[PDB]
């Protein structure tokens, strides 16, 4: 309805911020979460022992 009435900015758009994290917790720099194999200082990134 919102797009049909020519005002598409009133859309309810939700970023999938709980699956944004997993792709950045697997090493995607593209979102800038900077955790867990995308954080190069991480214990999981370095496998510390």
């Amino acid at each position: 309805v919102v797009v049909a009435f020519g005002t598409p900015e009133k859309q309810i758009l939700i970023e999938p911020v709980f699956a944004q994290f997993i792709q950045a917790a697997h090493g995607k720099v593209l979102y800038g979460l900077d955790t867990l194999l995308s954080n190069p200082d991480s214990v999981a990134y370095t496998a510390y022992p």
Binding site: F21, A25, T35, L36
Partner: peptide
């Protein structure tokens, strides 16, 4: 009765829910 064995494992799983959110909120790194 106070359900020890039920709440014992629910608080274990909820502690896993809170641990992963600490990585997502940068509390633990």
């Amino acid at each position: 009765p106070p359900y020890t064995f039920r709440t014992g494992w629910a608080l274990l799983l909820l502690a896993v829910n809170f641990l992963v959110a600490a990585y997502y909120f940068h509390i633990i790194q």
